[PDB]
Design a binder for this molecule. Sequence first.
Ligand code: A1IR4
Length: 148
Amino acid sequence: NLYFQHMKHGRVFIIKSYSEDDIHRSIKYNIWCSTEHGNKRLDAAYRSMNGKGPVYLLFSVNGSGHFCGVAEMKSAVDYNTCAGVWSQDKWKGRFDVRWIFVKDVPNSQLRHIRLENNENKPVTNSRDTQEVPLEKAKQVLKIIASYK
Ligand SMILES: Oc1cnnc(S)n1
C-alpha cells in the first residue's frame, strides 16, 4: 500500500480518551489537550523535532474496542488557556492538531503488533501518550490508513 512510506524522521503516540465528545470537539476544531504529564511528553517530542518530521497521534476511546482515527500534532502546548472547554476541567491546556483519517478500526486488526518498549505488550493495551517505536507505528498507520 501507498500510505506513509518515507516517514523518514518521526515520533508516534497513542491517545486514550474518556470522552467521545472530546474526540468530536477535537475533530470539529483541530485541537487537543492531554494530562499534565501527557502535555509535557508530547510537547518535548514536538519541540525536539523542529519541523524535521511528523508527530502523529493514534486515537482510541477507552473501552470502545477500536481505534477511531489518526492526527498530526501541529503546534507546541499552550498551558494558560480557557478552562472548562473539555468534558473535565482536568484538561488544562491546548495544542493544535490536523486529523488525517477519521475512521473506526477494530482492535482485532491491530493487537498482534507489540511494543518492545512496553514490555512486549500489544499496541491495543496502551495508556495515554504511550510512544510507539517507528517501525511498529508504520504498521499501525498503514493498517488504519487502508482498513475497509
Ligand atoms: O479523556 C481525554 C483525554 N485527553 N484529552 C481529553 S480533552 N480528554
